[PDB]
């Protein structure tokens, strides 16, 4: 239930529970990330999930936090952003998404996380599909469940992390 | 949710929100949003709102303290009113017709702080809980849509 998330008593158990939940929902790769209030110390964010390690290292080395339109969206909004080609507008954002696809991150969405004590983060989930139409159909079918999941993960994850 | 997000002014926005809450079965709502003197909409009884401020109930109401610590909803249950002041508080709320309901905390991307409170009419708490749980996934999306669009309108 969303219950065993709150009940988990360790980051490793918690991570495993959240991973299984996303997998069970039909998502492929996830990244849950959380920082405390007024922080850009991305290098020490609480990070859970199975995003490819090579992508995570590439992202940090290339300074993509400053390029990725998902990150700037999350600083402005509580609403989800789907990884639509139309959000990768500048040349640097276009190249970023090309690189993302080499790492297998082609279809997906991110839920911004904004916590009660100012925590800031994201829950990103990738979908494996034959085409974007199929991927968007799947994500829309599970979005109401995901919308609750992201706040349960935010609340319980922030308690374990900070 | 689109016509909420597309509303032109606060009065139109408030009317849409109220109707959406009624369509989910809620008779009384209060939406409040403080910036990082708040933005207030709803149809809570005016006399309750005045009493609440005058009595300084913001420092007593367990819903308020919950909202400052959590993003998860809190249902108005006896078990959350503990102190003595908190029982008197819930007794007066009953006089205003606020017996069953829940509050969704609001935490905006720009640090806005608020609440979306919704009251339901029911014969008993078990029935009220069924009513609320049956629409909670929709309410969970609504509260973030209302947060985003309301913050943009009021600030």
């Amino acid at each position: 239930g969303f219950l065993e998330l709150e009940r988990s008593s360790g980051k490793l158990e918690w991570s495993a529970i959240l991973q299984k939940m996303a997998s069970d929902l039909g998502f492929s790769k996830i990244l849950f990330g959380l920082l405390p209030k007024d922080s850009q110390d991305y290098e020490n964010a609480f990070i859970v999930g199975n995003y490819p390690a090579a992508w995570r290292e590439h992202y940090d080395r290339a300074g993509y936090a400053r390029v990725d339109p998902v990150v700037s969206h999350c600083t402005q909004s509580v609403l989800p952003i789907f990884w639509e080609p139309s959000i990768f507008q500048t040349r640097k954002q276009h190249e970023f998404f090309e690189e993302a696809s080499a790492a297998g991150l082609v279809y997906g969405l991110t839920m911004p996380l904004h916590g009660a004590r100012g925590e800031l983060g994201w829950l990103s989930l990738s979908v494996e599909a034959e085409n974007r139409a199929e991927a968007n159909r799947f994500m829309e079918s599970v979005l109401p469940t995901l919308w609750m999941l992201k706040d349960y993960a935010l609340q319980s994850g922030a308690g374990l992390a900070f | 949710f689109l016509e909420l997000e597309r509303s032109s002014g606060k009065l139109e926005w408030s009317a849409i929100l109220q109707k959406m809450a009624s369509d989910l079965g809620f008779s009384k709502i209060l939406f409040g949003l403080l910036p990082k003197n708040a933005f207030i909409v709803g149809n809570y009884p005016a006399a309750w709102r005045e009493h609440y401020d005058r009595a300084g109930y913001a420092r007593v109401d367990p819903v308020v303290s919950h909202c400052t610590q959590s993003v998860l909803p809190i249902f108005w249950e006896p078990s959350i009113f503990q102190t003595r002041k908190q029982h008197e508080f819930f007794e007066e709320a009953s006089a205003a017709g606020l017996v069953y309901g829940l509050t969704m905390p609001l935490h905006g991307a720009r640090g806005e702080l608020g609440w979306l409170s919704l009251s339901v009419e029911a014969e008993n708490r078990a029935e009220a809980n069924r009513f609320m749980e049956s629409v909670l996934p929709t309410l969970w999306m609504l509260k973030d849509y209302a947060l985003q669009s309301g913050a943009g309108l009021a600030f």
Binding site: H73, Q76, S77, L79, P80, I81, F82, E84, L143 | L2
Partner: peptide
Amino acid sequence: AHHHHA
């Protein structure tokens, strides 16, 4: 319709 880009 749930896609947003701020």
